[PDB]
Amino acid sequence: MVAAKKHVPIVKKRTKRFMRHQSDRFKCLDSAWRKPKGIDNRVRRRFKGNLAMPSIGYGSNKKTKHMMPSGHKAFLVHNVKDVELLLMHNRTYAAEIAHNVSSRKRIDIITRAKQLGVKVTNAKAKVTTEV
Amino acid sequence: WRRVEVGRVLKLENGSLAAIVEIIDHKRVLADGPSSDPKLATPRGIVPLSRALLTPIVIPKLPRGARTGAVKKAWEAYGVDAKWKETNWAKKQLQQERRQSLTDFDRFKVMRLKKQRRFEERKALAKI
Amino acid sequence: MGRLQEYQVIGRHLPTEANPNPALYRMRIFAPNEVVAKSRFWYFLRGLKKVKKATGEIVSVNVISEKHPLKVKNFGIWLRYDSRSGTHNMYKEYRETSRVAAVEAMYADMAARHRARFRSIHILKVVELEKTEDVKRPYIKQLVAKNLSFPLPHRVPKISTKKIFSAKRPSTFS
Amino acid sequence: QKWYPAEDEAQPKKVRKAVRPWTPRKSLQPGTVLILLAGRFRGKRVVLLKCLDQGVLLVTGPFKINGVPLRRVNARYVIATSVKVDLTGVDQAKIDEVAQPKYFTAASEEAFFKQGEKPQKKPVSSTRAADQKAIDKALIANIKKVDMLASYLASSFSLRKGDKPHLMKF
Amino acid sequence: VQKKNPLRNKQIMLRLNPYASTFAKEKLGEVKAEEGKPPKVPASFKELLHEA
Amino acid sequence: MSSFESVVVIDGKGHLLGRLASIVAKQLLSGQKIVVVRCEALNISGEFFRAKLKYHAYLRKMTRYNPTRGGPFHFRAPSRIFYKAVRGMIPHKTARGAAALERLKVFEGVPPPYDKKKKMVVPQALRVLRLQPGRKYCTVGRLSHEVGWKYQDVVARLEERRKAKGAAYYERKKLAARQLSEAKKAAAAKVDPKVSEALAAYGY
Amino acid sequence: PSEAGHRLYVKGRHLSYQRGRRNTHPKTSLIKIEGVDDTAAANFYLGKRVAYVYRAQKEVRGTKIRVIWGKITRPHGNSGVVRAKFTHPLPARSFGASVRIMLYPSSI
RNA sequence: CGCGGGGUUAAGGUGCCGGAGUGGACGCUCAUCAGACUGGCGCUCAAGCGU
RNA sequence: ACCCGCACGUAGACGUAUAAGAAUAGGCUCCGGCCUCGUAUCCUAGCAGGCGAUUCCUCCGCCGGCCUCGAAGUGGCCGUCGGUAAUUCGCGUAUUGCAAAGACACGCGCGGGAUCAAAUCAGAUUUC
């Protein structure tokens, strides 16, 4: 037995993203959400068949917020001292090695995390197995 | 064919018979159903003509307005139950009531016995 | 109007020191339930004897069941219908087994032929034509004639509305 | 136990959910002919020997008559017919023996060299085969004694055109 | 944490009302009427009913 | 009662147009393959001239430009009239409506692949069950005659040839009935009657 | 030589989804069962499993046949139509398609 | 008027498009472009009108 | 049509069986009689359906002959061969254990070569 904690089932109220209105038509408009401010904008007036806007009713359960599908929460690590901070939180948190960590430091983090019982999300990074 | 008249017994919908006591309107009749068979009995009351089928049995001399005792006496005098038993509608009804009462084993025995009879009719037809 | 019932509504003024022991006015009202019977009784006593619901009370509300509902009889009903032009008095015959059934048919007939409402009809009186020949409506006299007997031609067979397709064309001799 | 709780893991509260015996349908009597609705013996007519627990039924379609071995089946996947065969002579001790809930249960060179190879389909038994014969002996004798029933149990049930299960009399 | 209907849950009814068990046991909901020959309706009431 | 069949052959003689059309359209959207034979013998309630002038109102709806694209195409065959009646009550602007309409085959008379098969009738749309006896009716085929259909006499002859072949079917069928019934009687003479009383008690 | 079919399901047709006039809810599907024309008959098939069988394009577990499983929940209307819920909503191209109403769970 | 699951309704509807009755009782109406508490198809012992 | 090389196997089958018409104030028929009701008729047994019998000349299917079908094309008779519980059995159906990648054959295709018959512009291209 080594997994995440016992947690209530993870329910996502909405899996799709909220796209900005008319952002699929214009290349100058990024898909990041912007609240429409026009008076006659039917997205803002919430007419039928239009885009929904983000609301606080779409929020996630506080017991499963920030939680991965495995049940752990992501903990960004830059060195070995950072994974050592998860000695007492091995079942609640998983190690996420930072993108600018070198290969040997990544090997050090992965080795220590395995001994501590901490899962690593990106353990298939720039390393390989030698026999 | 058939005409509505005092003494005309008619089958309703539920496998029951009711003799016309008096004609109320072009669409409704007063009818009374005095019998001994619980399935063929009918309470005295207004019977719409749309929900009734005329039966070729006639009570010969029914006084109009006859109450339940007189209609029962005429019913037993003619033998309306036996003539309903012999006509085609009740033979079809009994065939249907027996048909819906087969179980799975009864259906298997029906198909097997039909196969034996069928082989015998094939022999009889091959004679011809 | 639905399952109408004949209600015997007795009602009287409120008793006062100056005027004790009122007159106990009684009326027969055909209504679906008791609340309509009481309301129509007051609507009529507001009209006739000038007593009010606030200054009056209901003595009794009794169901008047038909004595012989298994015997077909002739009813003659007098009625006053307020039309667009004005109020008119009529009188109509009905062959029913109960006074309630006659009033129900009356309401259906005056709704179909004259487009009359429930609130626009005042049933003056409902009587039974015990003696033959009292009926004056020709249709009713046809039914009261000697030794009536008529066939039922072209009888549409009651087929199931969920039986969509039939293999055999049906017959209308039943 | 051995370890102190190393993380604040909450124990579950005591549930007030007790186990009471399953009450079967009045049509599920010992000896009733059952029509299977699912599985690899789907549509085959068997004979119920004993009603077990939590919905399970011990059934056996005499292997000689129909190829259904001594098996278990959920009661929600069977249709109980009106035919009940007499079980006089069938040893109830043998039925009780097979009805226990453990009858239908079960790193080296060869372990490595067997990886990726198809598992062998196991032959049955020498005592389970005898158990089937012991129950079937009296059952088949009674079924033959019953008129026409042996050909009934050998035929698979199926739905034809125009047959409505809601208007039937199973 | 969870409201239970006393009309559906008998234990909740017994908790709120301890009389429910002996109300059901002694059949106070199927109580019979007083015995003896009932009198007939007065003729005056009948002639008032079927008036003109 | 309720049956799911391969294909339902509907004999259109003595059927109201709209009612049979509605039943057929509901069947097509349900997923039933429908063929309708004898489309010339459908009935429209009312008089001749009412449906006649309504159809002239339909021909009067004409586009301003050349009648080639987007104009109301006027088809004068009775089966095309029934197809228009079905199509007006099916969502033809959707692909589901296109599939439902492609499930339907309308025909004049009884074509050769459809005179070998049993023809059904719809009691909810028959003229003798829906129309009052005192009312009048018109035939779609003679309506097509009086607007401009050019193929009426021809289907009349191949219709009466079909009727002659049906008369052949029933002299053969009376013949087959002779040996079937006399085989039934001769089989009842050698009926080994335990099976007979068993089948009588079991109903058959 | 048996020469006989083996059918242990009632044929059904998936008509549409539960809907009003301009609002369609794909989570529930309206299905007509062959032979069921009244609410009383529909009451028999309540709880029974329904299977939508279709060949797609491509073999996966040795076959190209895929099946979406569901259950009859309640009757719909007065003509014997039933409402059915499936793991995921039924395809909209299966409007008017053949589904298989099984005889389990069985209370017979 | 937060995001969902189940149940029940309001106004409006149950011939098809369109989910739900070619439901039931009583009458009337054939209109050479009836009428629709009609949008189209179409409907006439209605799929119209009054209860 | 051949020669080399390469590639892949259903807007909804599960018994997806059923031919006059004509009328609905009548029709059918054995000439006895029959008709609200297609709530009917056929067919429905065996490892997703085996072996050997006992026993039946009943049914189905394939090829030839005789003829039949044109409307948008098909069926009958005879003959050959194969299978064939109408009746009765001895064998195998299991641990798939309470419902959820081998070989052969037949086809549709390509990438080149030349094989007929043609088309377009002796000589260039294209087409099953």
What DSSP line would sit under F92-112, residue for residue? TTSHHHHHHHHTEEE-SS--G
| H or E, element range at D109 | helix D109-113
Both tokens assigned to G104 = 């389990």
Both tokens assigned to D27 = 């049509």
Query: What pairing do the DSSP bridges indicate for beta strands C150-151 and C121-128?
Result: unpaired
Q: Is B1 on the interface with C (CB under 8 A)?
A: yes
Both tokens assigned to B33 = 């159903």
- Closest C-alpha to F18, from F163, F117, F130: F130
Residue F135 CB lies within 7 Å of the nucleic strand H:
yes
- Closest C-alpha to F85, from F127, F172, F174, F22: F22
φ, ψ (nearest 5 deg) of residue C76: -120, 120
CA distance F196 to C144: 55
φ, ψ (nearest 5 deg) of residue D164: -110, 115
CA distance A74 to A83: 12
Cβ atoms of A18 and A66 closer than 8 Å: no
**Locus of tokens 């050019």:** F150
Residue F29 CB lies within 7 Å of the nucleic strand H:
yes
What is the DSSP track for D32-72? EEEEE-SSTTTT-EEEEEEE-STTEEEEEE-TTTSSEEEEE
Resolution in A: 3.0
Q: Amino acid letter at A100?
A: N
Grouping H, G, I as helix, E, B as strand and the rest as coil, residue D24 is coil
| H or E, element range at C100 | helix C99-113
CA distance F74 to F77: 9
What is the DSSP track for F16-72? BHHHHHHHHHHHHHHT--EEEE-GGG-EEES-HHHHHHHHHHHHH---SS-TTSSS-
Dihedral Cα A66, A72, A73, A75, nearest 10 deg: -160
Cβ atoms of A3 and A94 closer than 8 Å: no
Both tokens assigned to A74 = 């992501």
**Locus of tokens 């069977």:** D78
Q: Amino acid letter at F44?
A: I
CA distance B44 to B21: 9
- Closest C-alpha to F146, from F57, F61, F79, F51: F51
Cβ atoms of F48 and F143 closer than 8 Å: yes
φ, ψ (nearest 5 deg) of residue F167: -60, -35
Q: What's the burial of D130, exposed, middle or buried (CB within 10 Å: 0-12/13-18/19+)? A: exposed
C-beta atoms surrounding G96 within 10 Å: 20
Q: Which nucleotides of H are covered by protein (CB under 7 A)?
A: 1-7, 15-28, 30-34, 40-47, 49-51
φ, ψ (nearest 5 deg) of residue C137: -75, 120
Contacts with F43 (C-beta within 8 Å, 6 or more apart), sequence order: F14, F15, F16, F17, F127, F131, F137, F138, F139, F140
- Closest C-alpha to B28, from B15, B38, B18, B37: B18
CA distance A14 to A8: 18
For residue A91, which residues of chain D lie inside 8 Å, CB to CB? 7
What are the CB-based long-range contacts (under 8 Å, 24+) for G58-64?
none
CA distance B119 to G60: 48
CA distance F68 to D161: 50
**Distance in Å from the first CA to the final CA of chain C:** 34
- Closest C-alpha to B49, from B95, B85, B13, B16: B13
φ, ψ (nearest 5 deg) of residue C24: 60, 65
Tell me the C-alpha to C-alpha distance, in Å, between residue G61 and each of C107, G58, G64: 72, 10, 8
DSSP 8-state assignment for residue C160: -
Q: Which nucleotides of I are covered by protein (CB under 7 A)?
A: 9-26, 29-30, 34-50, 57-59, 71-73, 83-101
Label residue F195 left, alpha or beta by phi (over 0 means left) and psi (-120 to 50 means alpha).
alpha
Tell me the C-alpha to C-alpha distance, in Å, between residue D84 and each of D28, D29, D48, E36, F190: 10, 8, 9, 54, 35
Instruction: Sheet containing C87-96: give its strands across.
Output: C87-96, C73-82, C121-128
CA distance G101 to C1: 45
- Closest C-alpha to B35, from B61, B49, B56, B15: B15
Both tokens assigned to A55 = 């609301």
What is the SS3 assignment for C35-81? HHHHHHHHHHHHHCCCCCCCCEEEEEEEECCCCCCCCCEEEEEEEEE
Cβ atoms of B48 and B27 closer than 8 Å: yes
Angle between helix F17-30 and helix F95-102 axes, rounded to 10 deg: 110
Both tokens assigned to A123 = 């353990």
Query: What pairing do the DSSP bridges indicate for beta strands B42-48 and F137-139?
Result: unpaired
| H or E, element range at B92 | helix B88-99
Cβ atoms of F44 and F138 closer than 8 Å: yes
- Closest C-alpha to B29, from B7, B2, B13, B59: B7
- Closest C-alpha to D153, from D41, D66, D29, D73: D66
CA distance F68 to F62: 11
Q: What's the burial of D74, exposed, middle or buried (CB within 10 Å: 0-12/13-18/19+)? A: middle
DSSP 8-state assignment for residue F126: B
CA of B118 to C1' of I61 (A): 22
Interchain CB distance below 8 Å, B105 and D155: no
Which residues in window 110-129 of F are less than 7 A from strand H by Cβ?
124-125, 129
Query: What pairing do the DSSP bridges indicate for beta strands G49-55 and G9-19?
Result: unpaired
CA distance B6 to B61: 9
Interface test with chain C among B24, B28, B54, by most C beta carbons within 10 Å: B24
Cβ atoms of C10 and C24 closer than 8 Å: yes
DSSP 8-state assignment for residue C19: S
Give the largest Cα separation in chain D, rounded: 71
Contacts with D122 (C-beta within 8 Å, 6 or more apart), sequence order: none
CA distance C48 to C43: 9
Grouping H, G, I as helix, E, B as strand and the rest as coil, residue C126 is strand
What is the DSSP track for G55-82? E-SS-SSSSSEEEEEEEEEEEETTTTEE
Contacts with F179 (C-beta within 8 Å, 6 or more apart), sequence order: B125, B128
Angle between helix F194-201 and helix B104-126 axes, rounded to 10 deg: 130
Q: For residue F45, what are the β-bridge partners? A: F137
Say if residue G105 is preceded by a cis peptide, omega within 30 of 0: yes
Cβ atoms of F40 and F109 closer than 8 Å: yes
- B:D CB pairs within 8 Å: 30
CA distance E49 to C63: 8
**Locus of tokens 């006896």:** F133
- Closest C-alpha to C58, from C32, C82, C36, C81: C36
CA distance C94 to C100: 11
For residue C150, which residues of chain B lie inside 8 Å, CB to CB? 3-4, 26
Grouping H, G, I as helix, E, B as strand and the rest as coil, residue A111 is helix
Q: What's the burial of E40, exposed, middle or buried (CB within 10 Å: 0-12/13-18/19+)? A: exposed
Cβ atoms of A18 and A33 closer than 8 Å: yes
Contacts with D157 (C-beta within 8 Å, 6 or more apart), sequence order: B104, D35, D43, D44, D45, G8
Contacts with C36 (C-beta within 8 Å, 6 or more apart), sequence order: C29
Q: Is F6 on the interface with G (CB under 8 A)?
A: no
What are the CB-based long-range contacts (under 8 Å, 24+) for D138-141?
D138/D87, D138/D88, D138/D89, D138/D90, D138/D91, D139/D47, D139/D60, D139/D62, D139/D85, D139/D87, D139/D90, D140/D62, D140/D64, D140/D65, D141/D89
Dihedral Cα D28, D30, D35, D37, nearest 10 deg: 60
Tell me the C-alpha to C-alpha distance, in Å, between residue C7 and each of C79, C117, F108, F182: 18, 20, 65, 71
CA distance D40 to D61: 13
CA distance F110 to F138: 21
Compare all CA atoms of chain D with the CA of G5 and give the residue at the minimum distance. D158
Nearest nucleic acid nucleotide to C158, CA to C1' distance: I36
- Closest C-alpha to B87, from B40, B34, B50: B40
- Determined by which method? cryo-EM
CA distance F29 to G97: 10
Grouping H, G, I as helix, E, B as strand and the rest as coil, residue E47 is helix
Cβ atoms of G48 and G9 closer than 8 Å: no
CA distance C26 to C9: 6
Query: Interior CA angle at D105 toward D99 and D108, to 5°?
Result: 160
C-beta atoms surrounding A38 within 10 Å: 10
